[PDB]
Amino acid sequence: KIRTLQGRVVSDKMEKSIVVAIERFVKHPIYGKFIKRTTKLHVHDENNECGIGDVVEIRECRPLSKTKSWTLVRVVEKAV
Amino acid sequence: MVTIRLARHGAKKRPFYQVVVADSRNARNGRFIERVGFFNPIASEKEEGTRLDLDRIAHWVGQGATISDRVAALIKEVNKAA
Amino acid sequence: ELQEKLIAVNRVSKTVKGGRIFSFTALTVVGDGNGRVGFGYGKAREVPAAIQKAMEKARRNMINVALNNGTLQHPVKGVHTGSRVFMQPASEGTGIIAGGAMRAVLEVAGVHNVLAKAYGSTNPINVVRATIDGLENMNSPEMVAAKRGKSVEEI
Amino acid sequence: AKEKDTIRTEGVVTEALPNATFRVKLDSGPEILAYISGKMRMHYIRILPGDRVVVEITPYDPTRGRIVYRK
Amino acid sequence: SMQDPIADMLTRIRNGQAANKAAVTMPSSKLKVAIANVLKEEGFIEDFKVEGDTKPELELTLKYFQGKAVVESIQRVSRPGLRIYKRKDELPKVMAGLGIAVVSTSKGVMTDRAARQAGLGGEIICYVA
Amino acid sequence: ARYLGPKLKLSRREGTDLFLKSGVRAIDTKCKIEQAPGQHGARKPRLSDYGVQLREKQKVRRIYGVLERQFRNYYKEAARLKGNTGENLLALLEGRLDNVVYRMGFGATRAEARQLVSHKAIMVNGRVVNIASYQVSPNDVVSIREKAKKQSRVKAALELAEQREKPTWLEVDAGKMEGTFKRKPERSDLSADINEHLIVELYSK
Amino acid sequence: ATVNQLVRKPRARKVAKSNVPALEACPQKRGVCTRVYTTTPKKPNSALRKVCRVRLTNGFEVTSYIGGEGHNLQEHSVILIRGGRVKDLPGVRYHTVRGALDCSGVKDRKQARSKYGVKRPKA
RNA sequence: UACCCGCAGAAGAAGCACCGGCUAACUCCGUGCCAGCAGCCGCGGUAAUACGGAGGGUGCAAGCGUUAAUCGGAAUUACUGGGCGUAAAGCGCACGCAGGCGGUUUGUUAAGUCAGAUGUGAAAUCCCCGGGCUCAACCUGGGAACUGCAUCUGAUACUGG
RNA sequence: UUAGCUAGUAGGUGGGGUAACGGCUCACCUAGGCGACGAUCCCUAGCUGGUCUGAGAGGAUGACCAGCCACACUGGAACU
């Protein structure tokens, strides 16, 4: 039972943290067009191994800071 | 604690009770956990009038739910009927 | 046995030296209650001459519609000048629920159970014109089978 | 029914306002907006800015009156 | 620019048909060829061919009946500006089943009827009657 | 809650006999049946499409003694029910107790039958029902209660009844003054110059 | 027209502007009579129509019609007003409720009495 | 108390709006662009079915009208479901970032999309078939529905990578 | 007819703190964090089951019943 998210690294500046963006398509409730929506998550990156632009697999965990409730599971693709 | 009791629905002068398991502090006709029987005191008694899921009542007792004076009676009455 | 219905009577006017000349117009439909419908439109100085000229027109200029047990084959849209028209085959028991102009057409036509509605201009002469053509272009489970070259279940 | 508190007092056309309208000054006391009576307008009867005229005044609004008698 | 070649296909059919043309031809594509297949199999056209290897030109032989075009209406439903997807229990039917809807499924392109019977939904490519 | 005024006026306006009197008399010897009430009765109504729909609904209402609110509710129920709405409307009317009491011949009129009902002279299944609009069901037995059995209205009512066409769906024992609602009447049981679909049209627009 | 466009700017229904704002969604309002007078109407009509200016309990001050034949109203008369314009009297958007508060019923009415505040005559 | 029996006598119990067209219902008298009506058109200067009274009639009925108020009809904000030459509407013209969209083949992926399974979607309400109060409102049993969300496992034609 | 917003601010280390994770708090360090997928600012408002309307899609709405929240003369505070 390993619920997980996949997204790409938009910021790697913070010490041991990263900002990840999860993008998805969604049907528009009224006009039916499929629209891009993005969800940015502050995620934990102990060891700072995640570079900007990387594609990373993340999971939900307990609060790590005022805004971090997610941590890194592993890198998928890097340095496009 | 958790209690099994009658929530009085029906209409004026025509009471109809819904037997319910609930946190004893919630209002009588308010939040409950599970519905488990009903009790019509005005049933013609030509057909039915009192129906109890005794299996779930007991399950809840087994976990410490208490029981109304009136539900404790219904249960003895229904146990006698069959 | 032909059924005939008067849909609208109207007064128009023509202007001359002496003043206004008033006349009348009449819009009617005749139908056989079993899939044939004609509409007519006549003009005359007096109303009876007009209501009568129209029936005369309505009797010829009549067309066939491929009915289906007193109801339509499939939903249909009709259009003519201002009037956009829409019709649906309803289940049995409903009857004809529709505006006056359309009801008269559908009644005399033999369409027993339908949902109808007129959009835009409800100008009677163009509403009926649009309904007739709708029913007329309405194709049949057999002709599509003929068209497509197959007598599958769909026949 | 039609009450009867109407009056017929007279006066003189003062102003020649727009749309058959006049300043008509009542011989009595003041002048009122006075409009031309339907009848009168139907029978035409132009009305110069200085004629003796009859007015119909509703106590309801003394400020106004209808010209009845043409001249 | 040429951003919907399927509408283009629909339209070339519709217009040549209206123009009582014996055939119509267009740059080919698997997806066009999959739709042409359904049209033919449901008897809306005679037949079709693709010719060439590097720049394949697809050709549809149209069909006429009582000096009439077999294809009465042919319209694009889903489109680049508004994708339309349906579930199996939501699949439209055209003319109360007399016409067809072309549906694209995990198992390739087929009619509303086919997809219905095979427990599938998909992108609703067009209607034809 | 009941129409209490002159009755033949209603027949005269609708252009037909509404059976609002016993039937002892040719109606034309009691009123000018073929002429509307009033100063301008002789006048003809060049009658609109809405007009014919209204008058047909009035006709049925005036036959059964039902005012608008209850009758509209009858339409609503006919509509909700399965099967043809127009026919469902007439089933509901024809199932009323005041009506059934009339059809078994216990009352000379539906008005008289209604009074029988209201005045606790009618039982259903040996149980007293005193509300006119009580819906009667298949196999029910409605009867004149013992104390009301010697009322001369009832004997006369049963005599007239014997001279009307006899309804199929009711089994009446004139001696016992009891009768059985065998089944709901079909459409074919009821008069054919009632145009329910007009009433159905009036209430859908 | 475009789906894209509606997705950026949704259909937006126009909000209905009222014809009796002084009522503020109340069925009637109370008010004191500021002026009580007559005024003449618009083409093609002609009369001396009874109107009053009325300061309402909510501050609004409006002109209101005084329908019926005859009325005994003056300044400081406290009246009840309801919605209802007078068509050949521009500006007039309310009617006075005859037979409420200080406003008397129409004298001697027999037909349509309830629209003119008139009791049923003993008879 | 419900309910049942008895007594007295039709005895104590009918009003409101409307009738020019839309809109079911017409005449006379009074008034005379006045007094007045008026939801919209529009009535009123000597025959007014439109004002006011009357008689007659129509529609409702312990209510009936008026006002206020939401949605409907309104395809009149148009997703379903509209328009921009002359009716309201093409920016005076071009370049162009963001954005939307994107020709054709293969492989891959499996987010969109599709399928199935599981959990959840409180009860009441709505709907269906029954049951109980003389009927109905009302009360009530069971069902169906909650067209939604989430997880897992698949499918890979179309869209995206 | 509001386009920039942010110093406990965003994160890190350690001490303290809570019933418990947590800038909850403090020191030190890094310089981040949010925002045209509408932040900030301004106006308005308790949310839901549902209610009314509409064939539907919608539109309008959140008395009475039930679920959640918030408040208890106004502002602040903790004690048990």
mmCIF file of N, CA and C (backbone and C1' of nucleotides) in Angstrom, chain D residues 60, chain G residues 39-51 65-71 82 84-89 92 94-96 98 106 109 111-112 115-116, chain H residues 17-21 30 33-44 48 50-53 66-67:
data_model
loop_
_atom_site.group_PDB
_atom_site.id
_atom_site.type_symbol
_atom_site.label_atom_id
_atom_site.label_comp_id
_atom_site.label_asym_id
_atom_site.label_seq_id
_atom_site.Cartn_x
_atom_site.Cartn_y
_atom_site.Cartn_z
ATOM 1 N N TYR D 60 -59.139 69.514 -6.570
ATOM 2 C CA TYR D 60 -58.024 68.594 -6.356
ATOM 3 C C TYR D 60 -56.697 69.256 -6.720
ATOM 4 N N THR G 39 -51.657 66.308 -10.919
ATOM 5 C CA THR G 39 -50.738 66.472 -12.033
ATOM 6 C C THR G 39 -51.405 65.951 -13.292
ATOM 7 N N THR G 40 -50.962 66.449 -14.435
ATOM 8 C CA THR G 40 -51.573 66.088 -15.694
ATOM 9 C C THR G 40 -50.755 64.982 -16.307
ATOM 10 N N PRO G 41 -51.392 64.134 -17.120
ATOM 11 C CA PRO G 41 -50.684 62.997 -17.694
ATOM 12 C C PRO G 41 -50.147 63.250 -19.094
ATOM 13 N N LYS G 42 -49.644 62.170 -19.678
ATOM 14 C CA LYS G 42 -48.839 62.173 -20.893
ATOM 15 C C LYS G 42 -49.696 61.961 -22.145
ATOM 16 N N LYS G 43 -49.167 62.256 -23.337
ATOM 17 C CA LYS G 43 -49.882 61.933 -24.588
ATOM 18 C C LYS G 43 -50.353 60.480 -24.542
ATOM 19 N N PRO G 44 -51.611 60.223 -24.942
ATOM 20 C CA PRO G 44 -52.645 61.129 -25.444
ATOM 21 C C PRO G 44 -53.679 61.521 -24.396
ATOM 22 N N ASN G 45 -53.398 61.204 -23.144
ATOM 23 C CA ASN G 45 -54.377 61.391 -22.094
ATOM 24 C C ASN G 45 -54.378 62.794 -21.500
ATOM 25 N N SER G 46 -55.367 63.045 -20.656
ATOM 26 C CA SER G 46 -55.639 64.374 -20.158
ATOM 27 C C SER G 46 -56.577 64.266 -18.968
ATOM 28 N N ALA G 47 -56.160 64.838 -17.841
ATOM 29 C CA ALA G 47 -56.880 64.738 -16.572
ATOM 30 C C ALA G 47 -56.146 65.513 -15.498
ATOM 31 N N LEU G 48 -56.722 65.499 -14.305
ATOM 32 C CA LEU G 48 -56.039 65.954 -13.109
ATOM 33 C C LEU G 48 -55.941 64.777 -12.173
ATOM 34 N N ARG G 49 -54.801 64.097 -12.232
ATOM 35 C CA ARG G 49 -54.571 62.875 -11.469
ATOM 36 C C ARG G 49 -54.064 63.178 -10.069
ATOM 37 N N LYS G 50 -54.641 62.515 -9.079
ATOM 38 C CA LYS G 50 -54.256 62.717 -7.703
ATOM 39 C C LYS G 50 -52.983 61.930 -7.354
ATOM 40 N N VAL G 51 -51.927 62.629 -6.948
ATOM 41 C CA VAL G 51 -50.708 61.978 -6.485
ATOM 42 C C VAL G 51 -50.251 62.625 -5.192
ATOM 43 N N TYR G 65 -49.497 57.145 -6.342
ATOM 44 C CA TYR G 65 -50.825 57.457 -6.841
ATOM 45 C C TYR G 65 -51.889 57.294 -5.753
ATOM 46 N N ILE G 66 -52.962 58.065 -5.863
ATOM 47 C CA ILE G 66 -54.088 57.955 -4.945
ATOM 48 C C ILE G 66 -55.304 57.600 -5.761
ATOM 49 N N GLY G 67 -55.471 56.324 -6.075
ATOM 50 C CA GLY G 67 -56.534 55.907 -6.972
ATOM 51 C C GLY G 67 -57.931 56.024 -6.385
ATOM 52 N N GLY G 68 -58.938 55.883 -7.240
ATOM 53 C CA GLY G 68 -60.328 55.970 -6.822
ATOM 54 C C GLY G 68 -60.869 57.366 -7.045
ATOM 55 N N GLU G 69 -62.186 57.522 -6.936
ATOM 56 C CA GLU G 69 -62.832 58.828 -7.071
ATOM 57 C C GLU G 69 -63.039 59.441 -5.710
ATOM 58 N N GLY G 70 -62.262 60.475 -5.419
ATOM 59 C CA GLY G 70 -62.336 61.144 -4.142
ATOM 60 C C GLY G 70 -61.375 60.605 -3.108
ATOM 61 N N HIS G 71 -60.718 61.516 -2.414
ATOM 62 C CA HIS G 71 -59.898 61.134 -1.283
ATOM 63 C C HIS G 71 -59.732 62.281 -0.296
ATOM 64 N N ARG G 82 -47.935 50.690 -1.995
ATOM 65 C CA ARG G 82 -47.620 49.412 -2.611
ATOM 66 C C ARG G 82 -47.022 49.657 -3.983
ATOM 67 N N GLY G 84 -46.718 49.499 -8.030
ATOM 68 C CA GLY G 84 -47.677 49.640 -9.104
ATOM 69 C C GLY G 84 -47.570 50.979 -9.788
ATOM 70 N N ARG G 85 -47.013 51.000 -10.993
ATOM 71 C CA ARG G 85 -46.835 52.272 -11.686
ATOM 72 C C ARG G 85 -48.143 52.810 -12.230
ATOM 73 N N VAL G 86 -48.106 54.088 -12.556
ATOM 74 C CA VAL G 86 -49.169 54.741 -13.267
ATOM 75 C C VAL G 86 -48.559 55.052 -14.606
ATOM 76 N N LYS G 87 -49.088 54.464 -15.657
ATOM 77 C CA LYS G 87 -48.411 54.473 -16.940
ATOM 78 C C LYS G 87 -48.322 55.840 -17.631
ATOM 79 N N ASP G 88 -49.373 56.661 -17.535
ATOM 80 C CA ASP G 88 -49.409 57.950 -18.260
ATOM 81 C C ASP G 88 -48.943 59.092 -17.315
ATOM 82 N N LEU G 89 -48.271 58.672 -16.253
ATOM 83 C CA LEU G 89 -47.712 59.555 -15.253
ATOM 84 C C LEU G 89 -46.253 59.129 -15.031
ATOM 85 N N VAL G 92 -44.203 58.130 -11.573
ATOM 86 C CA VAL G 92 -45.110 57.530 -10.605
ATOM 87 C C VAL G 92 -45.011 56.018 -10.685
ATOM 88 N N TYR G 94 -45.567 53.906 -7.663
ATOM 89 C CA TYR G 94 -46.238 53.297 -6.524
ATOM 90 C C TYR G 94 -47.700 53.727 -6.447
ATOM 91 N N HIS G 95 -48.498 52.918 -5.768
ATOM 92 C CA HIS G 95 -49.892 53.232 -5.509
ATOM 93 C C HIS G 95 -50.143 53.322 -4.012
ATOM 94 N N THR G 96 -51.077 54.178 -3.613
ATOM 95 C CA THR G 96 -51.460 54.281 -2.220
ATOM 96 C C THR G 96 -52.536 53.254 -1.929
ATOM 97 N N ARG G 98 -55.705 52.390 -0.542
ATOM 98 C CA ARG G 98 -56.920 53.001 -0.008
ATOM 99 C C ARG G 98 -57.430 52.203 1.192
ATOM 100 N N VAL G 106 -62.743 54.393 -0.709
ATOM 101 C CA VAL G 106 -63.470 55.182 -1.676
ATOM 102 C C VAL G 106 -64.909 55.216 -1.215
ATOM 103 N N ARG G 109 -68.426 52.953 -3.187
ATOM 104 C CA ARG G 109 -68.075 51.862 -4.094
ATOM 105 C C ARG G 109 -68.884 50.603 -3.816
ATOM 106 N N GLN G 111 -68.627 47.857 -6.574
ATOM 107 C CA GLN G 111 -67.862 46.874 -7.339
ATOM 108 C C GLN G 111 -66.360 47.063 -7.124
ATOM 109 N N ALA G 112 -65.646 45.951 -6.973
ATOM 110 C CA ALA G 112 -64.206 45.960 -6.748
ATOM 111 C C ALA G 112 -63.830 46.647 -5.450
ATOM 112 N N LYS G 115 -60.323 46.585 -3.642
ATOM 113 C CA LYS G 115 -59.214 47.334 -4.223
ATOM 114 C C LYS G 115 -59.302 48.820 -3.864
ATOM 115 N N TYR G 116 -60.323 49.202 -3.098
ATOM 116 C CA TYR G 116 -60.512 50.609 -2.733
ATOM 117 C C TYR G 116 -60.896 50.785 -1.263
ATOM 118 P P A H 17 -63.839 42.391 -4.435
ATOM 119 O "O5'" A H 17 -63.177 41.770 -5.735
ATOM 120 C "C5'" A H 17 -61.774 41.835 -5.914
ATOM 121 C "C4'" A H 17 -61.352 41.041 -7.117
ATOM 122 C "C3'" A H 17 -62.007 41.440 -8.423
ATOM 123 O "O3'" A H 17 -61.459 42.602 -9.007
ATOM 124 C "C1'" A H 17 -62.111 39.110 -8.212
ATOM 125 P P C H 18 -62.366 43.494 -9.983
ATOM 126 O "O5'" C H 18 -62.451 42.629 -11.308
ATOM 127 C "C5'" C H 18 -61.293 42.132 -11.957
ATOM 128 C "C4'" C H 18 -61.658 41.036 -12.932
ATOM 129 C "C3'" C H 18 -62.620 41.403 -14.050
ATOM 130 O "O3'" C H 18 -61.966 42.015 -15.139
ATOM 131 C "C1'" C H 18 -63.329 39.402 -13.046
ATOM 132 P P C H 19 -62.707 43.127 -16.020
ATOM 133 O "O5'" C H 19 -63.742 42.297 -16.873
ATOM 134 C "C5'" C H 19 -63.295 41.499 -17.954
ATOM 135 C "C4'" C H 19 -64.439 40.775 -18.618
ATOM 136 C "C3'" C H 19 -65.552 41.632 -19.192
ATOM 137 O "O3'" C H 19 -65.228 42.197 -20.442
ATOM 138 C "C1'" C H 19 -66.504 39.879 -17.976
ATOM 139 P P G H 20 -65.298 43.787 -20.631
ATOM 140 O "O5'" G H 20 -64.526 44.042 -21.995
ATOM 141 C "C5'" G H 20 -65.182 43.793 -23.217
ATOM 142 C "C4'" G H 20 -64.291 44.092 -24.395
ATOM 143 C "C3'" G H 20 -63.135 43.138 -24.636
ATOM 144 O "O3'" G H 20 -63.536 41.942 -25.279
ATOM 145 C "C1'" G H 20 -62.377 45.365 -24.823
ATOM 146 P P G H 21 -62.852 40.542 -24.897
ATOM 147 O "O5'" G H 21 -61.465 40.573 -25.680
ATOM 148 C "C5'" G H 21 -61.438 40.589 -27.100
ATOM 149 C "C4'" G H 21 -60.029 40.637 -27.637
ATOM 150 C "C3'" G H 21 -59.052 39.639 -27.036
ATOM 151 O "O3'" G H 21 -59.145 38.352 -27.617
ATOM 152 C "C1'" G H 21 -58.072 41.780 -27.029
ATOM 153 P P G H 30 -78.741 58.255 -19.314
ATOM 154 O "O5'" G H 30 -77.721 58.350 -18.108
ATOM 155 C "C5'" G H 30 -78.137 58.848 -16.850
ATOM 156 C "C4'" G H 30 -76.955 59.037 -15.937
ATOM 157 C "C3'" G H 30 -75.854 59.943 -16.458
ATOM 158 O "O3'" G H 30 -76.124 61.319 -16.262
ATOM 159 C "C1'" G H 30 -74.901 57.941 -15.655
ATOM 160 P P C H 33 -65.200 66.349 -22.261
ATOM 161 O "O5'" C H 33 -63.745 65.725 -22.351
ATOM 162 C "C5'" C H 33 -63.238 64.987 -21.252
ATOM 163 C "C4'" C H 33 -61.736 64.916 -21.269
ATOM 164 C "C3'" C H 33 -61.030 66.028 -22.037
ATOM 165 O "O3'" C H 33 -59.830 66.383 -21.354
ATOM 166 C "C1'" C H 33 -60.436 63.932 -22.950
ATOM 167 P P C H 34 -59.857 67.475 -20.158
ATOM 168 O "O5'" C H 34 -61.106 67.064 -19.258
ATOM 169 C "C5'" C H 34 -60.926 66.314 -18.072
ATOM 170 C "C4'" C H 34 -62.164 66.322 -17.223
ATOM 171 C "C3'" C H 34 -62.076 65.568 -15.910
ATOM 172 O "O3'" C H 34 -61.484 66.367 -14.903
ATOM 173 C "C1'" C H 34 -64.178 65.187 -16.993
ATOM 174 P P A H 35 -60.719 65.677 -13.680
ATOM 175 O "O5'" A H 35 -61.763 64.578 -13.200
ATOM 176 C "C5'" A H 35 -62.739 64.919 -12.237
ATOM 177 C "C4'" A H 35 -63.587 63.739 -11.865
ATOM 178 C "C3'" A H 35 -62.840 62.514 -11.392
ATOM 179 O "O3'" A H 35 -62.483 62.605 -10.035
ATOM 180 C "C1'" A H 35 -64.487 61.887 -12.959
ATOM 181 P P G H 36 -61.133 61.913 -9.541
ATOM 182 O "O5'" G H 36 -61.336 60.384 -9.933
ATOM 183 C "C5'" G H 36 -60.429 59.708 -10.799
ATOM 184 C "C4'" G H 36 -61.101 58.528 -11.454
ATOM 185 C "C3'" G H 36 -60.220 57.401 -11.978
ATOM 186 O "O3'" G H 36 -59.748 56.530 -10.964
ATOM 187 C "C1'" G H 36 -61.772 57.968 -13.623
ATOM 188 P P C H 37 -58.380 55.711 -11.167
ATOM 189 O "O5'" C H 37 -58.745 54.646 -12.274
ATOM 190 C "C5'" C H 37 -59.637 53.584 -11.996
ATOM 191 C "C4'" C H 37 -59.776 52.690 -13.200
ATOM 192 C "C3'" C H 37 -58.566 51.846 -13.543
ATOM 193 O "O3'" C H 37 -58.478 50.681 -12.753
ATOM 194 C "C1'" C H 37 -59.388 52.870 -15.502
ATOM 195 P P A H 38 -57.065 50.304 -12.116
ATOM 196 O "O5'" A H 38 -56.171 50.050 -13.398
ATOM 197 C "C5'" A H 38 -56.448 48.946 -14.231
ATOM 198 C "C4'" A H 38 -55.615 48.994 -15.480
ATOM 199 C "C3'" A H 38 -54.115 49.082 -15.272
ATOM 200 O "O3'" A H 38 -53.564 47.802 -15.036
ATOM 201 C "C1'" A H 38 -54.795 50.681 -16.884
ATOM 202 P P G H 39 -52.398 47.533 -13.958
ATOM 203 O "O5'" G H 39 -51.195 47.040 -14.870
ATOM 204 C "C5'" G H 39 -49.978 46.606 -14.307
ATOM 205 C "C4'" G H 39 -49.349 45.527 -15.138
ATOM 206 C "C3'" G H 39 -49.349 45.764 -16.634
ATOM 207 O "O3'" G H 39 -48.227 46.519 -17.028
ATOM 208 C "C1'" G H 39 -50.183 43.605 -16.171
ATOM 209 P P C H 40 -48.392 47.931 -17.762
ATOM 210 O "O5'" C H 40 -48.289 47.567 -19.297
ATOM 211 C "C5'" C H 40 -47.172 46.840 -19.766
ATOM 212 C "C4'" C H 40 -47.500 46.152 -21.053
ATOM 213 C "C3'" C H 40 -48.287 46.977 -22.034
ATOM 214 O "O3'" C H 40 -47.493 47.911 -22.722
ATOM 215 C "C1'" C H 40 -49.248 44.841 -21.880
ATOM 216 P P C H 41 -48.111 49.348 -23.066
ATOM 217 O "O5'" C H 41 -49.132 49.077 -24.253
ATOM 218 C "C5'" C H 41 -48.676 48.720 -25.551
ATOM 219 C "C4'" C H 41 -49.788 48.210 -26.436
ATOM 220 C "C3'" C H 41 -50.933 49.162 -26.766
ATOM 221 O "O3'" C H 41 -50.632 50.071 -27.812
ATOM 222 C "C1'" C H 41 -51.813 47.054 -26.165
ATOM 223 P P G H 42 -50.805 51.663 -27.627
ATOM 224 O "O5'" G H 42 -52.370 51.967 -27.674
ATOM 225 C "C5'" G H 42 -53.307 50.996 -28.064
ATOM 226 C "C4'" G H 42 -54.371 50.753 -27.012
ATOM 227 C "C3'" G H 42 -55.431 51.807 -26.797
ATOM 228 O "O3'" G H 42 -56.344 51.950 -27.867
ATOM 229 C "C1'" G H 42 -54.819 50.923 -24.732
ATOM 230 P P C H 43 -57.398 53.157 -27.831
ATOM 231 O "O5'" C H 43 -58.387 52.703 -26.678
ATOM 232 C "C5'" C H 43 -59.435 53.547 -26.290
ATOM 233 C "C4'" C H 43 -60.229 52.971 -25.155
ATOM 234 C "C3'" C H 43 -61.230 53.942 -24.587
ATOM 235 O "O3'" C H 43 -62.388 53.992 -25.375
ATOM 236 C "C1'" C H 43 -59.991 53.027 -22.816
ATOM 237 P P G H 44 -62.677 55.294 -26.262
ATOM 238 O "O5'" G H 44 -62.936 56.385 -25.136
ATOM 239 C "C5'" G H 44 -63.975 56.141 -24.200
ATOM 240 C "C4'" G H 44 -64.099 57.210 -23.147
ATOM 241 C "C3'" G H 44 -64.160 58.660 -23.601
ATOM 242 O "O3'" G H 44 -65.424 59.044 -24.107
ATOM 243 C "C1'" G H 44 -62.751 58.452 -21.704
ATOM 244 P P A H 48 -71.537 56.433 -25.713
ATOM 245 O "O5'" A H 48 -70.914 54.983 -25.553
ATOM 246 C "C5'" A H 48 -69.999 54.461 -26.506
ATOM 247 C "C4'" A H 48 -69.051 53.489 -25.858
ATOM 248 C "C3'" A H 48 -69.725 52.407 -25.020
ATOM 249 O "O3'" A H 48 -69.006 51.184 -25.137
ATOM 250 C "C1'" A H 48 -68.248 53.639 -23.664
ATOM 251 P P A H 50 -67.490 49.493 -21.236
ATOM 252 O "O5'" A H 50 -66.062 48.777 -21.289
ATOM 253 C "C5'" A H 50 -65.606 47.948 -20.223
ATOM 254 C "C4'" A H 50 -64.287 48.427 -19.674
ATOM 255 C "C3'" A H 50 -64.220 49.928 -19.411
ATOM 256 O "O3'" A H 50 -63.339 50.188 -18.324
ATOM 257 C "C1'" A H 50 -62.609 49.354 -21.028
ATOM 258 P P C H 51 -63.752 49.827 -16.814
ATOM 259 O "O5'" C H 51 -63.882 51.246 -16.111
ATOM 260 C "C5'" C H 51 -62.752 52.080 -15.894
ATOM 261 C "C4'" C H 51 -63.175 53.468 -15.468
ATOM 262 C "C3'" C H 51 -64.298 53.515 -14.443
ATOM 263 O "O3'" C H 51 -63.804 53.497 -13.119
ATOM 264 C "C1'" C H 51 -64.815 54.938 -16.265
ATOM 265 P P G H 52 -64.113 52.247 -12.174
ATOM 266 O "O5'" G H 52 -65.561 52.546 -11.587
ATOM 267 C "C5'" G H 52 -65.742 53.635 -10.700
ATOM 268 C "C4'" G H 52 -67.176 54.092 -10.632
ATOM 269 C "C3'" G H 52 -68.216 53.008 -10.466
ATOM 270 O "O3'" G H 52 -68.296 52.510 -9.149
ATOM 271 C "C1'" G H 52 -68.950 54.553 -12.086
ATOM 272 P P G H 53 -68.860 51.034 -8.926
ATOM 273 O "O5'" G H 53 -70.420 51.193 -9.163
ATOM 274 C "C5'" G H 53 -71.249 51.744 -8.157
ATOM 275 C "C4'" G H 53 -72.675 51.869 -8.615
ATOM 276 C "C3'" G H 53 -73.409 50.573 -8.905
ATOM 277 O "O3'" G H 53 -73.875 49.912 -7.749
ATOM 278 C "C1'" G H 53 -73.783 52.064 -10.672
ATOM 279 P P U H 66 -55.188 40.369 -8.798
ATOM 280 O "O5'" U H 66 -54.545 41.483 -7.888
ATOM 281 C "C5'" U H 66 -54.996 42.815 -7.998
ATOM 282 C "C4'" U H 66 -54.308 43.689 -6.990
ATOM 283 C "C3'" U H 66 -52.795 43.618 -6.993
ATOM 284 O "O3'" U H 66 -52.197 44.405 -7.993
ATOM 285 C "C1'" U H 66 -53.566 43.412 -4.793
ATOM 286 P P U H 67 -50.740 44.012 -8.491
ATOM 287 O "O5'" U H 67 -49.848 44.199 -7.194
ATOM 288 C "C5'" U H 67 -49.550 45.492 -6.717
ATOM 289 C "C4'" U H 67 -48.722 45.446 -5.462
ATOM 290 C "C3'" U H 67 -47.381 44.739 -5.539
ATOM 291 O "O3'" U H 67 -46.372 45.474 -6.204
ATOM 292 C "C1'" U H 67 -48.476 44.079 -3.576
#
